[PDB]
Design a protein around this ligand. Sequence first.
Ligand code: SF4
Ligand code: SF4
Ligand code: SF4
Ligand code: SF4
Ligand code: FES
Ligand SMILES: [Mg+2]
Ligand SMILES: [Zn+2]
Lengths: 208, 96, 386, 112, 125, 115, 230, 176, 48, 97, 29
Amino acid sequence: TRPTIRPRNDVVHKQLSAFGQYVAEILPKYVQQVQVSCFNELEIFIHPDGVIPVLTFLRDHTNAQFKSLADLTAVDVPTRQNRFEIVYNLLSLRFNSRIRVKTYTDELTPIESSVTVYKAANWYEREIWDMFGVFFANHPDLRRILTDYGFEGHPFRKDFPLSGYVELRYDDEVKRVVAEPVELAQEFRKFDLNSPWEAFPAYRQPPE
Amino acid sequence: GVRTSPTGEKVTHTGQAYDDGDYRRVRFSDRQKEVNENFAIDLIAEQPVSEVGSRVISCDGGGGALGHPRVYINLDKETKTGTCGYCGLQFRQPHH
Amino acid sequence: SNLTLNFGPQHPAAHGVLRLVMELSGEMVRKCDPHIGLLHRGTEKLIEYKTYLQALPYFDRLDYVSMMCNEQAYSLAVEKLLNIQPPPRAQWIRVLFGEITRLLNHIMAVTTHALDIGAMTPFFWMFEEREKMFEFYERVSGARMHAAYIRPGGVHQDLPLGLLDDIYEFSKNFSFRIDELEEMLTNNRIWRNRTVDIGVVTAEDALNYGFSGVMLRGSGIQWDLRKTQPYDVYDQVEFDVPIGSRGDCYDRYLCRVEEMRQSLRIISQCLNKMPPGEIKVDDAKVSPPKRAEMKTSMESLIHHFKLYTEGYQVPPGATYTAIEAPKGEFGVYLVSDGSSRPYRCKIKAPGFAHLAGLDKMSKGHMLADVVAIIGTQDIVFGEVDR
Amino acid sequence: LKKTTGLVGLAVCETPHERLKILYTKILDVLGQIPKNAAYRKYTEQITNEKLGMVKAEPDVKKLEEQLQGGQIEEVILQAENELSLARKMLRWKPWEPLVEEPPANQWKWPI
Amino acid sequence: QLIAVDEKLDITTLTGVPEEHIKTRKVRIFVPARNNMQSGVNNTKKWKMEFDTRERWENPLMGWSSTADPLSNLVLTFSTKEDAVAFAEKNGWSFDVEERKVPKPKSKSYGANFSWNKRTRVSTK
Amino acid sequence: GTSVKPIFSRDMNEAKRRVRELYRAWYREVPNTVHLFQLDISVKQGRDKVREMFMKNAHVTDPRVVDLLVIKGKMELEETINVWKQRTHIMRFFHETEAPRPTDFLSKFYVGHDP
Amino acid sequence: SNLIEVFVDGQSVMVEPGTTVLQACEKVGMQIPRFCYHERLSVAGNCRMCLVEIEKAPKVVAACAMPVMKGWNILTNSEKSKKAREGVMEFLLANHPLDCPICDQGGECDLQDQSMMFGSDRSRFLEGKRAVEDKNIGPLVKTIMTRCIQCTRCIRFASEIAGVDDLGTTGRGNDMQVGTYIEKMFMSELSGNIIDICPVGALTSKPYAFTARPWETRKTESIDVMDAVG
Amino acid sequence: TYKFVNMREPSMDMKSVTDRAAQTLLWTELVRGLGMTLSYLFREPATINYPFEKGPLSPRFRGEHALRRYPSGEERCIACKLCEAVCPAQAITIEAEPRADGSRRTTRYDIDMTKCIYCGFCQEACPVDAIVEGPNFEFSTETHEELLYNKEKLLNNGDKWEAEIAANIQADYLYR
Amino acid sequence: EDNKQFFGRHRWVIYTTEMNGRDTFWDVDGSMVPPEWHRWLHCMTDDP
Amino acid sequence: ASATRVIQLLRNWASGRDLQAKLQLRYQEISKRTQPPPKLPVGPSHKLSNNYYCTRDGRREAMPPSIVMSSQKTEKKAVTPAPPIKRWELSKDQPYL
Amino acid sequence: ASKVKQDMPPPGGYGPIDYKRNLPRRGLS
Ligand code: SF4
Ligand code: SF4
Ligand code: SF4
Ligand code: SF4
Ligand code: FES
Ligand SMILES: [Mg+2]
Ligand SMILES: [Zn+2]
């Protein structure tokens, strides 16, 4: 089991479980779940109303001191009633640790902006709004960041087609760049790669 | 083994050639049509059939690891040679 | 009313695809507003349509000055999700070529910063060394920059039989090139006047604004991922972390030069300690078998077929894997759903956070000062825009 | 005695023991308004009392820095200020209350 | 505070999809049938939502397969049929839903291969 | 109460008032847009385009959707005023190059298979 | 009721008497590996891929033919079951031809998939492989019998479903071949289905040969109009 | 383990102050920089005489694609479509059918070289060394359409570059 | 060849003045090198 | 290099160091472009026996994350995510630049 | 029968690689 298998670290697992219990105890009002993965990553699932408190705690508590916001992003899962999942990755330099905070929202429910807690969030939230259409309340300047001016739709959503809806070309009659409905000389070839046999028995779901 | 179409166009080894009424020949005006001259079917047909003294032979295409995956050919039928499914080389047992 | 100016994208100091909308009072900079996305290619959505092996060259093309480092970060994330371990020789090769890539990136950063400020000469001197390192890349992979050499099980191929000697020959001479660069820039009063006390950022503001790498260490923050959270074999090499004192452009320049020296040190250590053995994980359900085995063994052929058509499946989960890339902290949030295609891949690039703070660093500065500040942040827009 | 704390924007503090005592006493006074059953209050009162006790028993600055594990006692003062601000915010937020709302049935179920 | 919206959920005006690809599209919600070439059943667990096939033609150059509709490759995965229906309704697409087809439980008996008087006795193994 | 929280407006009246504010701002901006971008259209043409764009979403009855539409329209106006958009972006609202697609049954039958 | 209680990996399941281990396992979503078992054919029990461990029993049992007993605990993922699967797959692949690139079963092979999910990744077979001459059974079914693994699915289908007793096995031991022993056409109005039941490329479609791969295809569910059966 | 880069203060000796004043008034550092430039002026330049001299390459180099043959002249490709499935850019299009002799051979083999990222995954996936990335890199065209390769063009490329492709393969197949 | 020049200048080609059909006295280019000399000239091997 | 001795002296004086010791151009000390063939050893799993894949298959040892404090349902000292990071040491090799 | 051949450092090791900064004084008073 030695050469080709990634080794385990039970000490970090125990420490992360203890700190997850600690955070859940201190903030019962917003914490809904705590997990530690098999590769020692701590995850905290919270109610959407606790974004500002929990993060503030994790930034300012003497035992947390998660001063750095490494990354903030969203995940689109259409089968869920709350379509969008907001993920915050935080780094603590004092204790040399990383934590993850996850909440949820849908297309119409705004999420409170965390610019006051972390300045770094300012662009990330913008990007989320650009790519998924999640509105952030009380954002100092919330606008598109990555897409073209006047772009309609949110590309990172699962129902958004890969090639989009419009394409650009220069037209000499009007002497300018114009947008037209997308047309492809070669259509993208969809591949069915999934095997009809189960791969991981440990992740099997109840058959209802 | 190139042949000439009735319109004068070279026929590729896949057999493709535009008809007389096809406008798409205009792309070859003032230019040329690219046709590979070495036909693999004709080239493989020239290889002599290998006589072996065993019911089952092995083929890897030559060159060892530089060929194709090694396969085993049965040679029990006397009315037809054994053909490699990768290389096209033919094998047979001594008959007559 | 202030003057409103478009700085780039067609501007020598705009790094290609930056549209800096600047409000100026005279030449004083009242406001900076960076418009980005002029190099947004929708990389993450495209990755969602590929297998894990097919998504690897996207990470090459992300930060096209640090290629093996992006490959390494992606590979570490996928290995963590796969619960596999690369062989030791692969890890030593990864760290060696990561240090070479750090040298390449630091050369590019320092020389382009000097060119933007006005020192056009060291660019040509150091791009010959960059060319030789490109030769090393091409010899090991067949590509000068976009190698795709580092894979989520190890490396694609073994080193050619004479590569270590040539790397040693290059490394025993690179220090004099660094010395000539420093003779050009370090003590020049024009360079110091252009860089000293320019773009000063405090340690607390750097931590809150999401800065990383040199942007932290120039302010005195004693942080480095290869020292605090080592990943491949970095716990078996000895090197020093340069720390700034003033938090300005000059301290960051000095930090980058000393980091080039430390990369030379690590390269020496890696050259001496290269072990024998295989280069990719001995698990044919993840790494492809050798060509000779694929043409002889039925299992090897089946696994080659399935790995190159469907790919390997990754157990369901989500990870955030970060490395100390030459430009800062480069991270991947990777979400797998049990399939052979990643469900979601979010790329964290240090350039995003560093550029989001350009307005803060440029307060009370001139146009040339803003040029210097853009140069000192080490921004490549392939990773910023994605 | 110390100069150039090493972090840009952080100032060397003379008389840091009294500053720390003031900050910890203020933190305790703010925590006194939080219900006794709240885990936040008991936990941070515990850690604050340990830090205050170590500050009260060590006249040397470097020895205090080594005991505190705080990294450049100016940063310890900054952390005490951050904790005081957080304590006031937590007094306003009241996060010791029961869960606001249970998540939907399969909100956190992965894969799918 | 809450405002108590009592309307049907409709995000059509926010998705930026052209109105042609909302009103004239017909989606199919179904559990995909097992590939008859293999016995594995792992690809018949989830619900899929797909769009109606549109025209594909031949490229005048190189003879490739050209399309003109952006939803040709859009396939969505859901855990239950109700989730797929809710997604389709809130996106404004008209849908057709096929009920899950599950193989019936079979009655297998090895000894039946050697019946004394029944017709199930085999002639070879 | 359906457990839904607002963005800005609590009923249809506030959403309508925000719509009217945005419409006033766009109507005032149109002549400045025509002058600055050097468009070959009249002010009346641009105002009719604004009216058409506003009426395209006249069927909405959800205050949250109206709120998000107003927010997107505000971003569009802010893009236009600051000259972040170009003449190409502004003129994409008119589809001058696109050939009009016929709507009756016979023409659709003659050209192809699309309904 | 008449149901009896069995355990799959310690989970209680209520099953009718006469239910086999395979059906009990699939009642909780666990698909046992198989090559010769088909739920619409008579039980064969020859491929031995379905061998599973019963708790407190030293011998593994064939899940496709073994009726579940009261109180049995089926261990579908224990070391014994995994080792049995690996050994059986090793035997299956020992004489299989290196034909995957030229085989039409490429991305659709049960042999390939179950080798990737249940078999090993290397080979320790250091001998020469066997080769079998091909048989001509008509223009519809292309036959390459070197890829045959002798599951006898086609023979049972012909004998039972099609009512045609033309297929069988000749010889014994390693040199046992599936065919008709004579040059005979396998004409049946349902003769093509043996292409689908064959887990490997031994029986393939001749009109379809070499034209496409399974991952390229887009699948459209439709209704046949060639008769009134629909 | 860390080191400081800019934490040195200068000596306040009268002679040291005099050297600093002399450096300020007489520009000694700028003369040092001029000396560095002058020393570089008298070195041999690194320029090579393209096109009469070429930059060094390696047998692993990835360039213009080619389809290869067996020594008998039969095509190596058997239309497994592994290269088509592995291509990250979807730059390969393949159509096949039974040949007149029953051989499994392609009827269409197209590579869009303006889609190709030149990663070489196709030649790693290929089980018979059929498709390779060649050593040629000087094949710039004057039109876009010339970079849409079909099977005839690729077979011509193989026939043209085989003498070099085979030798390059011989020197590197033991690392593969 | 000349082994005393540094790596890059140690091998060179003087092109012909008359290729298949064109006059290459002035117009020469790298595509005029046959594949065997292409391998030698780009230093992929030491064997002419 | 092929530079004249006087030019070498002038270059050395202008630069302030000995240039001929470390030349940027590579003349002859590089590796030959034709190398002997390698052998490339095999990995640990290339054994003939005692090599069952179930004993060395990491992908199947991966487990779903362990749930701590699901919401569906003494002293008790406070804890930290990890022990405090240790202070760094000041570069015995070269502490100041 | 031949032994394993691989790209390795020479027996012993490589010579030391200079990395420290080098700037001579090179001046009068
Ligand atoms: S039947 Fe399956 S395992 Fe056998 S050669 Fe064909 S694809 Fe490969
Ligand atoms: S031909 Fe196919 S179905 Fe018939 S016995 Fe052989 S493998 Fe089984
Ligand atoms: S080199 Fe890469 S991108 Fe180009 S055809 Fe081959 S696999 Fe596709
Ligand atoms: S080139 Fe190689 S991989 Fe591609 S289809 Fe032909 S044989 Fe298969
Ligand atoms: S499936 Fe049970 S023995 Fe074949
Ligand atoms: Mg079959
Ligand atoms: Zn052959």
